[PDB]
Structure 1
Amino acid sequence: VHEFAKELDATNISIDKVVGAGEFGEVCSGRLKLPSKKEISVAIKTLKVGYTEKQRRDFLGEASIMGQFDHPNIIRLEGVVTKSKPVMIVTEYMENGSLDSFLRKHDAQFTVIQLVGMLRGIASGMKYLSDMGYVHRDLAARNILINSNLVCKVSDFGLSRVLIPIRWTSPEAIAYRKFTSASDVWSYGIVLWEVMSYGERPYWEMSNQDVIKAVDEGYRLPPPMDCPAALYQLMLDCWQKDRNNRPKFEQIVSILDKLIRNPGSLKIITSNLLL
């Protein structure tokens, strides 16, 4: 764990408030004093009192993964506290919380260019993650955090592994656990839909067996209200049945960089599911 995560001194951490509930314990906000004396706001996950040794290994396991990434669009690991209790994982603070809950509060309140900026960040983070040989497997708006400047960053590495949420998972990964960077691109397509839908749930409350069967039959989520044609086409490209025909994350970033540069192109606007 200490290979990729520095041990922090608990005397340098102050806890301010509880801002979330985790699988392994609470999530809090607070402050960290760095060796340079600079003080930064941080998020702190704590391991619940009375944890089993297995829970501890799973909890810290996420930090070992997160710690291998240094990128503007992947949540920064400040470090861990293991030598005292409670055991903690400390990351950079993200003022606006999870992306899905954030967008739900602001339905139709952002410009297309702002939403594209968010999507570009996510795609750039995923490009780095895939470059490093990791498949996330849980890429979803709820696992993206967003800061005061609207910068989006991939978080939650609980399911990730070196090379399951049905609604976000590619058909081949559902069918026989074929997880690749192309299955993450499928997931990214779902995130793209979530963003353009301001946090609508993918497939709403459809039974899981019907999400599985419908997608396998060729059905896809419909265009969100007022969705630019270019962005809906990108979803469809991400959702190709043949994984080899899906764009790579580098191509997705490049697509989005073009849309940011030419805000004009976004002016062409596009059963519940579409075949």
Structure 2
Amino acid sequence: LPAFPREKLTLRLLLGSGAFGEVYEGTAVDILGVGSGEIKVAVKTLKKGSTDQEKIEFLKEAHLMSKFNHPNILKQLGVCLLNEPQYIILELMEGGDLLTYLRKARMATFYGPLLTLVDLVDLCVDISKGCVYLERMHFIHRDLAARNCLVSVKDYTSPRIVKIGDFGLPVRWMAPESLMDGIFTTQSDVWSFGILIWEILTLGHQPYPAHSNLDVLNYVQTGGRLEPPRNCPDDLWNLMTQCWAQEPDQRPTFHRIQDQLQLFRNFFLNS
């Protein structure tokens, strides 16, 4: 657990209060090493006067986050758990959640979307590399969706990186086995990854839009799948359908998904 002195941490603005207590944008000194300097950070706080039951949950969250060191997984830089309020220090993803970033790219201008197909494919590659790491760690996320991913930039012209954020009812993202049997495997995360790349390729559309949570479980259990995104490339729709195979055993691995996305990216770039 990366113990960090709260004296080297400064809280500057409030990002929100949708987790344990509040999330702050701040700065940390020497968090990446003694002479590294001041770096921008996100700070997950646990409210002072929190119950023992809440402290243990915060401690669990810090233990899970300490296991992840990958460019496409949100990184925990340090923790302040000796005193109250408790802090979980994270790398700052200034662009916010991927769903909002996608929706704003579609709904901002008249000329066209602020994200091209090649920008979208690179978002899929970034997420799939994060999933390969998780599959290798034998970690099952349980909630892979665009709302649970973060973007490093807020603009649409700078180089960007998408990271898998907060770790796991979200019915539209759940595979059929999770819905009826409560089975949660890396192959059910593969189902969710296909839902997330559909979200990316539609620039933030809600899956199964005409349907409700009860209609979704009925429709999906009986073989019904999402309609293809408008002008979606064939090889991307091929991989999306592979991810939604009724049997988890028939669904491809994350290592295969990364290769197929990489092969499509090369096939697309050569044209």
TM-score, structure 1 normalization: 0.89
Partner residue in 1 for 2:20: 24
Identify which range, 185-194 or 223-232, moves more after superposition.
223-232
Q: 5 Å matches for 1:1-275?
A: 5-34=1-30, 35-37=33-35, 38-107=37-106, 108-148=113-153, 149-157=159-167, 159=168, 164-204=169-209, 206-263=211-268
SS of 1:106 mapped into structure 2: helix
Please give the alpha-carbon distance, in whole angstroms, between the structure 1 residues aligned to 2:164 and 2:45: 20
Q: 3-state SS of the aligned residue for 1:156? A: coil
Aligned-residue identity in percent: 39
SS at structure 2 position matched to 1:250: helix
Deviation at 1:192, TM superposition (A): 0.5
Contact 1:60-1:89 at 8 Å conserved across structures: no
AA at the equivalent of 2:165? S
Distance 1:40 1:264 in 2: 36
The CA deviation at 1:264 is 5.4
CA distance in 1, matches of 2:71, 2:96: 16
Secondary structure of the residue aligned to 2:85 is coil
Distance in 2 (CA, whole Å) between partners of 1:126 and 1:18 is 30
Residue segments in structure 2 that go unaligned for 5+ positions in a row: 107-112, 154-158
* 1:30-70 C-alpha deviation (Å, 9 max, x unpaired): 11111423221111111123311111111231121111011
Deviation string 1:165-209 (CA, Å, 9 cap, x unpaired) is 111111011111111110000000000011011111112263211
What is the alpha-carbon distance in structure 2 between the residues aligned to residue 62 and residue 73 of structure 1?
A: 18
Q: Distance in 1 between matches of 2:256 and 2:184?
A: 20
Q: In structure 2, how many angstroms separate the alpha carbons of the residues matched to 1:53 and 1:130?
A: 32
Aligned with 1:130: secondary structure? helix
Question: Contact 1:29 / 1:43 at 8 angstroms: preserved in 2?
Answer: yes
Partner Cα distance (2:191, 2:83) in 1: 41
Q: What amino acid is the match of 2:9? A: I
CA contact (8 A) 1:22 1:45 kept: no
SS at match of 1:30: strand
Secondary structure (helix, strand or coil) at the match of 1:122 reads helix
The amino acid of 2:218's aligned partner reads K
Conservation of the 8 A alpha-carbon contact between 1:240 and 1:246: yes
In 2: Cα distance, 1:117 partner to 1:69 partner: 21
Q: Deviations over 1:122-158 (max 9, x none)?
A: 111111111111111011111111112321111112x
Question: 3-state DSSP class of the match of 2:268?
Answer: coil
Distance 1:49 1:122 in 2: 35
Name the CA distance, whole Å, in 2 between partners of 1:260 and 1:62: 35
Q: What is the distance in 2 between the residues matched to 1:261 and 1:188?
A: 21
Q: Give aligned pairs, total.
A: 257
- 1:94·1:145 contact (CA, 8 Å) conserved in 2? yes
Q: Matches of 2:250 and 2:81 in 1, distance apart?
A: 45
CA contact (8 A) 1:146 1:153 kept: yes
**CA distance in structure 2 between the partners assigned to 1:167 and 1:230 by the alignment:** 23
Contact 2:47/2:84, CA 8 A, preserved across alignment: no
User: Structure 1: 5+ residue runs without aligned partners?
Assistant: 268-275
Kindly provide the amino acid, as one letter, of the partner of residue 77 in structure 1: Q
Deviates further, 50-59 or 241-250: 50-59
Partner of 2:105, secondary structure, is coil
Distance 2:206 2:49 in 1: 35
Partner SS, residue 153 of structure 1: strand
What secondary structure, in the 3-state scheme, does the structure 1 residue paired with 2:252 have?
coil
Rounded Cα–Cα distance in structure 2 between residues aligned with 1:96 and 1:23: 18
